[PDB]
Amino acid sequence: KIEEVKSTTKTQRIASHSHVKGLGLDESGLAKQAASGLVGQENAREACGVIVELIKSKKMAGRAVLLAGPPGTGKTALALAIAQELGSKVPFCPMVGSEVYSTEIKKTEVLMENFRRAIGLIIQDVTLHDLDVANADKLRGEINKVVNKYIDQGIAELVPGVLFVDEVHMLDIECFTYLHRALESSIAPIVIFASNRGNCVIRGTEDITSPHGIPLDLLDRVMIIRTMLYTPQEMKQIIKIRAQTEGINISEEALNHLGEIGTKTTLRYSVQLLTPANLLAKINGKDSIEKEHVEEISELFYDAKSSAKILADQQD
Amino acid sequence: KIEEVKSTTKTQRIASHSHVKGLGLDESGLAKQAASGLVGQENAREACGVIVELIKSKKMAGRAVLLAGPPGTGKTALALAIAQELGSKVPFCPMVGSEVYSTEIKKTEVLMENFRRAIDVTLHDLDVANARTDKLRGEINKVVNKYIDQGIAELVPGVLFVDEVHMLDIECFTYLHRALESSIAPIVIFASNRGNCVIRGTEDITSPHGIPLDLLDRVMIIRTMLYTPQEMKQIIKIRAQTEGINISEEALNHLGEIGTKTTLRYSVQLLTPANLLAKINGKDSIEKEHVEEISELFYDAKSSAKILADQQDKYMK
Amino acid sequence: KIEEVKSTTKTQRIASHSHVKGLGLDESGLAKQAASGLVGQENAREACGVIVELIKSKKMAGRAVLLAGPPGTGKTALALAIAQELGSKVPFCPMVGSEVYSTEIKKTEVLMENFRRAIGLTLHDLDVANAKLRGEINKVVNKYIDQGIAELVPGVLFVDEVHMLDIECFTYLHRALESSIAPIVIFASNRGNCVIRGTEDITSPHGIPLDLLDRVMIIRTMLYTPQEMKQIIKIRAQTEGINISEEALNHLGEIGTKTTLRYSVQLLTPANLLAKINGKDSIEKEHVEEISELFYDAKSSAKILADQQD
Amino acid sequence: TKVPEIRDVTRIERIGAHSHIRGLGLDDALEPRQASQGMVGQLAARRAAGVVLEMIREGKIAGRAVLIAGQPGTGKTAIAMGMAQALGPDTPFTAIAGSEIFSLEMSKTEALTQAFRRSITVSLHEIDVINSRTQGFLALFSGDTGEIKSEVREQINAKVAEWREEGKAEIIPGVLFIDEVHMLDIESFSFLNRALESDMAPVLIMATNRGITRIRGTSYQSPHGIPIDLLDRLLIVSTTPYSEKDTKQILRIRCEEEDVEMSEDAYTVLTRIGLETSLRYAIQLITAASLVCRKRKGTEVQVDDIKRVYSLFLDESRSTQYMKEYQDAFLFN
Amino acid sequence: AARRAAGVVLEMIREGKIAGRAVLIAGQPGTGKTAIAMGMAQALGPDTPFTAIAGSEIFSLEMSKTEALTQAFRRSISLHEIDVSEVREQINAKVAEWREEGKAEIIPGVLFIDEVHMLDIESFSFLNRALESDMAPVLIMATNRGITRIRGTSYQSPHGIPIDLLDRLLIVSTTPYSEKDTKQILRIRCEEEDVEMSEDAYTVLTRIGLETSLRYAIQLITAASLVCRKRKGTEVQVDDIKRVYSLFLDESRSTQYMKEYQDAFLFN
Amino acid sequence: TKVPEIRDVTRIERIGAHSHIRGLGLDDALEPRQASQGMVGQLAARRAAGVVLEMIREGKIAGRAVLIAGQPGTGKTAIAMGMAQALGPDTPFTAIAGSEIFSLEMSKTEALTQAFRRSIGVRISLHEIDVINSRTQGFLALFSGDTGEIKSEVREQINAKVAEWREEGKAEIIPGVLFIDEVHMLDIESFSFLNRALESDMAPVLIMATNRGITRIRGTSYQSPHGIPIDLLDRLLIVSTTPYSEKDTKQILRIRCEEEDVEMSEDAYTVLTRIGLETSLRYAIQLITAASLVCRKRKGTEVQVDDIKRVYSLFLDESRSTQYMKEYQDAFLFN
Ligand SMILES: Nc1ncnc2c1ncn2[C@@H]1O[C@H](COP(=O)(O)OP(=O)(O)O)[C@@H](O)[C@H]1O
Ligand SMILES: Nc1ncnc2c1ncn2[C@@H]1O[C@H](COP(=O)(O)OP(=O)(O)O)[C@@H](O)[C@H]1O
Ligand SMILES: Nc1ncnc2c1ncn2[C@@H]1O[C@H](COP(=O)(O)OP(=O)(O)O)[C@@H](O)[C@H]1O
Ligand SMILES: Nc1ncnc2c1ncn2[C@@H]1O[C@H](COP(=O)(O)OP(=O)(O)O)[C@@H](O)[C@H]1O
Ligand SMILES: Nc1ncnc2c1ncn2[C@@H]1O[C@H](COP(=O)(O)OP(=O)(O)O)[C@@H](O)[C@H]1O
């Protein structure tokens, strides 16, 4: 009997998205240009809005949402963005698609560790994984007996979460059917996938091509949402917003120079060049940044795609 | 120990070959066009007319027989035939090749129970009653050997029908030989429908029909043709009345020309539904108003893929 | 403990090597032409004497020697030689990098048993005086070395055909190379750009990982000439007490040019006996022209095996 | 012993799109009449579909099974579900996919033999919900799974084979639906040859949408990825794509089955969309447009409130094309 | 020189200089290969136990591959019959002075293994460690294939054998037979098997032997006697010679006959 | 319970060559002077590395990682130790190659766990605290033959015993740096382990090394940059060095004579420089040692061009053995 195990929520992946407040629409079900932290992509945001109103309407029996989109547009960002319109601070457990290939852990025993970070409980709220670390098969068995009484007692309440899984094409054929059997029991959390590839062969069968590396029987219970590439007339805002969280003053042409990077390579490479760029202003004795630094950093560190081209042409 | 075990035989494997009564042989060493269940394919039947001489003079020392042919040249037919001429309830087990890949068991145990199915009293049935396993093997091997040394019940080696051989692996080819070179071994006659391919388990080493020279010199080779539209109607005509279905001459000759489109087995397995169509049309025989109906409603093997490949090419761009 | 284990040797691999007993150098650092069996290899034997001093000056610290030469060009030769100038009775054991594929001995164990074949006073002998037991003979040699009654000496390890070792054994070999006691190891290849077993996707020189290559030193032996080759077998016949004719040395050297050397030198003992068929003494020419068509090699057989198979 | 209270734990929502199937819809002389209990069109299979059903009642089916071949969008499930009602008013219908044998919570044996019992009052697999152990708790015990042995089966097999003559206990054939057959390999098929040797083995319907491939597990090709020895004991029935009018009755059923009203202009543009990409694609957009009019409260959708959903929610096909278009923008310099 | 190249190494083995090497008898598969291999044990001294095992006789399920290399080496001595798991752990210690004692003397064995290119890299390994013994015998091998990918690796080798061992043995190839050489073989195996044949029947019996096989002719010597018994002629004339040929073929004909069958089926 | 003074147990062969650098050679405003502290050239790679040293010092380095991609033979591992010496006098440093994880003496995760134990520093490191309480050692090569078992519950026990001495006041804990050479050897089963270790507080900082561009990832069937999955390609800091100049060559070559106390004439410094950029820098420095003890054999201890133009002909380079053996086996194919 413990109700204070509140030391939870590994945060370092989602710590880079503190600015997001939710989805932030009007009563007319349409999008604003910049609201609740999010900026742009007016297309797919009502697609969150129609889906999230189906959640409380309980229409989503055995359904899922795919997120087909290029690397680096905010497929993590919208995935968090619906986990603030479920409201009352629901849990949100992102992960990585390649986090299931471990050494000592069986492949089922991470998804239980994934799912229990999505099942949330003078009312305070924890996850089922939190009450698992409170006591650390029947080791994870007798923690049912704690909680099944309590909704029958009428004090705590079960709420669903968002198991946002990214880069699905690494996943082999086994975890799908363990997902699919566990997708739709009674109150399992909303499952959202995202990936960036096309015809991907499922790992382990080597002949069945398929869209997005998914077995074809599952995909037709899933709805598909896309997100386009950004434009620099608005792409200035998001890094400006993220730097406005961290108190960093920057000039505008440098950010207009920084916008070239988000066109040449990812946005994920683009927001990287703030905190290892602003720290150089302190050495030159300035708080705000000027054009020399973002110049100087851009030849000091290279992106992964730049690392590809320069290495092989200098290899031969 | 308990010798009343009356029925253990998979009857559906021997269901579609009930109508054979013999090889239809001469004392001149010849055969006839229709006698005791067979029609045509005479030197194939007469090669069995050779082997029935050495099965009764005991000259098959280490030896067996393959059958070679396309699907539907009577390979199961001659298979179940020979147990009849050997006389007085010769035991029979048809075994396909790919019946060995089950997760419950290793591959060698499927084989020895068929070895104990092959050779009244059989060896598999003694092991079913006594239980309610390889521990049970010698205690039953001793007692009937004690009984035959006392002179109780005869034990004649039977026929094994090893079907579908080109998907067999390596370790059973090695395994089969060790009891094969006895005198208590039964006959293990093959059937094949696949040519020059690699022995399974070697993954690189090709062989005629994937069987090693280990066996290719101990096994006798026979070759068959395919049936003509004259000959195959008597196959259908005999099975139509052992299945007890009245049939005209008219619609039957439309049935046979499908037998040169697909195999002969696709011709015969539609006999039972096409008849039971006509019992809804309210007759007792079948006419041409049914053979045109069934073969446009139940599809064959080869056109089933050939239909779907011919339209999938435009559907997924 | 019980220290009378005098002879434990796989004598057959070194059985065709009991003639070589010296490198044949000057004191000043050049190479003689032909002394103690070593013929030729003029840019090869000075490589041995250099590593002789870096052994003796305690400066083979963390490096390795690789021999690269085609089969027949003396790879097994100079490896036996180096143990003959660092004093006599130094341990010398030849292994082949396919032998570790035992059915019942782990690839840990078959190496450590052959490592301790290479350190003497051997270490392999003291664990077969009686029979882990290796931990029980940890203390037995410990009291002797602090008694100063038996010394500690490094030896030489010889690996052949070494493309047939995977990624795995190298990292057992790389770290275990790095004691202050461990015997130096001679590598031996005949490979070019090869694919490392265990990955099938990393390629590198000599079938050897890119870690343990820069700290390996590279020595080439070249081919031979028949007038070099003819003195080899002339050295051989005196060492076995078998008389021989002049044109026998002319004829047998040609197959040394043709196939290789190891195919050539085994042929004496039957051709000696082929002379004893007729009861003569010398190996006259008809014995020499008779064998290579009757008995085969691996090279010309697989030519006539597979072609007449067709 | 203590298990007759095992009435049903039925599936309601996964078989919940196939609500409007109540039989095959035949004549007494086995003739189609094209509009009965939901089945619209597709007489070519359905006329043949009545034939095997008659062979089931006469016991002429032992050693014979049904294979349905068809594309995505021409009724592999409905004709399979349509045989359930006319065979009996309460028969087990079990619609697993072929991928369901590839679970890591059991081997390929325990997935299928449990699925094999699932189509044999009550089902023989339903007895294993209490008379082996106690499961069915709150939702966190879906996440974990223990193993039932073979020991529970022969004890359960001992009652009902000898409660067979009791009169209170009865046995009834179901039907096993194996979607996507070429996913399975020949490690599993040889188990199925021993399965249909039994007396109470239910009838078998399997699904495919491929032509010639290789068998997985070995290195030889065949029709369908099934070896010949199972192919030569089959009844083989294919279907045909629906036409535009055929769908025009079809989509009227489900909107009637979900109390929404769509316009007569909006009706024919919807089956334009279903004939553009997929028949399955037309289904998911409907309730996805039902919420759309519910904000403006107009109680009947119009065509502009359809394309807003169609502008948002893509299909499966252009979800591949736009990803290849961005992938065109990667490898081309 | 099947008996003339054979006597060459036959003198070394009783001289005592085969140590570290053994015999490999390659050739066409079954050229009297085992027959001349067994004849070497017949060419050897007073008690020479022989074995003719397979290259793939190791791939077993009751006994392991390591068990497959413990027994036949003990059979090719024999300590196996004195044995017949860890039963060797006593008798190998017991006879350590029984050989010096003097009841029954000991001999090595005449191990022949058929078609050693049916092996793998783990099983060639145990041949070296077993041949270290002084009681480790002379061994005999077989193959018909040269440059072959070794079972266990991505690397080929001629003869299927590790290349160091290919220069650690001795190499025999059995010479194939010609028209008179077939003519003596079936003749010897006619009066051995004593069924009356006309003189022309031995002649054309070589004519299919030069095309198809060699035990194919001896396959018919019992069957065609019975169709001669079918007419009660008591000598198989040219009729049954040219009758059962249509009924009995060899596979390289027959699989070719499906091969000229299969293509038009996949064409039309 | 008797190990505060068995402090350092390492290899003297790994730190046996590269002693000639103490720092990176920087001012207060992140510019070098082209010769200071041992580090020699390619200053852009130098001055970017100080930012990684700056970001460590400020408390915003967390999660980020270091990768160096250059040609094989331009001082890749050289740059990482200067980060250690510019981080204090005693910061730990552990050199691990790519193939060092494929142990048969232990599993794929305990070595990478034992990789992380060496890079956690405490003064009066954490890894040697484990090895005395686990097993008893300190022998000759007889114990380098066999192994022991490193009991896992000991590691949590000191993780319960470091809960005593950390916040008490005797011991401060200093993060070290771990080093992974040739990163394109590690399978994806351990990349997730690197994902699941950086998020700790006292987790060290990691620097990886490579020479591979776009390649198939070890473990899956996907061509990617560097043999690294996409999600962990992007939390990195990535630096690239050029091949060396010729003024840079003699700059190092001068410094690499006093380490091995060799006294070189002005003929070798010409030809070793040109031979140094012909095969590899690494093949050049290896040649210095052996030519010296041929010079003593020819009596006079000043190395002139005769020994160097003998030992280059005595000891070949790996770049033409891969010619010579290949050119032999080309002649082997011709019947
Ligand atoms: N519309 C947006 N609103 C807020 N942040 C965004 C938006 N689009 C992208 N970002 C930011 O850009 C980054 C891109 O994330 P995403 O597109 O999911 O690709 P990745 O997961 O590869 O980083 C995220 O850090 C996110 O915070
Ligand atoms: N000569 C024959 N006499 C009787 N039945 C035959 C004859 N030839 C073929 N059949 C029938 O045709 C069917 C062919 O069966 P099977 O031997 O499996 O075909 P295949 O020869 O292709 O293997 C069998 O039902 C068999 O009864
Ligand atoms: N340089 C040499 N001079 C004299 N004899 C040699 C020489 N090299 C090898 N031999 C002898 O010839 C045989 C072949 O050995 P070697 O050539 O070293 O191995 P390989 O043939 O595998 O290269 C050995 O028995 C050795 O005693
Ligand atoms: N002839 C039909 N009668 C009734 N419903 C149909 C028919 N054809 C298709 N459908 C509907 O279309 C959907 C397709 O279901 P299913 O049969 O699983 O897919 P497929 O058509 O690809 O085989 C189902 O919702 C089903 O109700
Ligand atoms: N700028 C430099 N300053 C000092 N030493 C250097 C410099 N560049 C290279 N080196 C030396 O080059 C050698 C190669 O270093 P290392 O990174 O281990 O090998 P590689 O260059 O093959 O990756 C080291 O001895 C290093 O000291």
Numbering used by the authors:
A (entry chain C): 2 to 122, 234 to 248, 273 to 452
B (entry chain A): 2 to 120, 237 to 249, 272 to 456
C (entry chain B): 2 to 122, 239 to 248, 274 to 452
D (entry chain F): 8 to 127, 241 to 453
E (entry chain D): 51 to 127, 243 to 249, 270 to 453
F (entry chain E): 8 to 131, 243 to 453
Question: What did the authors write?
Answer:
R2TP (named after its components in yeast, Rvb1-Rvb2, Tah1 and Pih1) is an Heat shock protein 90 (HSP90) co-chaperone complex assembled from RuvB-like protein 1 (RUVBL1), RuvB-like protein 2 (RUVBL2), RNA polymerase–associated protein 3 (RPAP3), and PIH1 domain-containing protein 1 (PIH1D1) (1–5). RUVBL1 (Rvb1p in yeast) and RUVBL2 (Rvb2p in yeast) are essential and related AAA adenosine triphosphatases (ATPases), while PIH1D1 (Pih1p in yeast) is a client recruitment protein recognizing casein kinase 2 (CK2)–phosphorylated adaptors containing a consensus DpSDD/E motif. RUVBL1 and RUVBL2 assemble into heterohexameric rings with domain II (DII) from each subunit protruding from one face of the ring, while the other is defined by the ATPase domains. Here, we report cryo-EM structures of R2TP and show how access to the nucleotide-binding site of RUVBL2 is coupled to binding of the client recruitment component of R2TP (PIH1D1) to its DII domain.
To specifically explore the heterogeneity of the asymmetric “open” conformation of the RUVBL1-RUVBL2 ring, we reclassified the images using a mask focused on the open RUVBL2 subunit. 3D classification in three subgroups (71.8, 11.8, and 16.4% of the particles in each group) revealed two major conformations, which we then refined independently. Whereas the overall structure of the ring was similar to R2TP-ΔNT_structure, a much-pronounced distortion of the open RUVBL2 subunit was evident, accompanied by complete disappearance of regions corresponding to the N-terminal segment of RUVBL2 and ADP from the nucleotide-binding site. The rest of the subunits in the ring showed clear density for ADP. Thus, it appears that we have captured two conformations of a PIH1D1-bound complex, both inducing changes in the RUVBL2 subunit where PIH1D1 binds, but differing in the presence or absence of ADP bound to the open RUVBL2 subunit. The resolution in the open ADP-empty RUVBL2 subunit is lower than that in the rest of the complex, and we thus only considered the secondary-structure elements for model building. During model building, we found that the distorted rim of RUVBL2 corresponded to an N-terminal segment of RUVBL2 (residues 1 to 49), which was completely lost in the ADP-empty conformation. Comparison of the conformations of closed and open RUVBL2 subunits from the ADP-empty structure of R2TP-ΔNT, after alignment of their neighboring RUVBL1 subunits, reveals the motions in the context of the RUVBL1-RUVBL2 ring, and several major areas of change became apparent. First, changes in the position of several α helices suggest that the torsions of the DII-external domain accompanying its interaction with PIH1D1 are transmitted to the internal region of the DII domain, and this relays the changes to elements essential for nucleotide binding and nucleotide exchange.
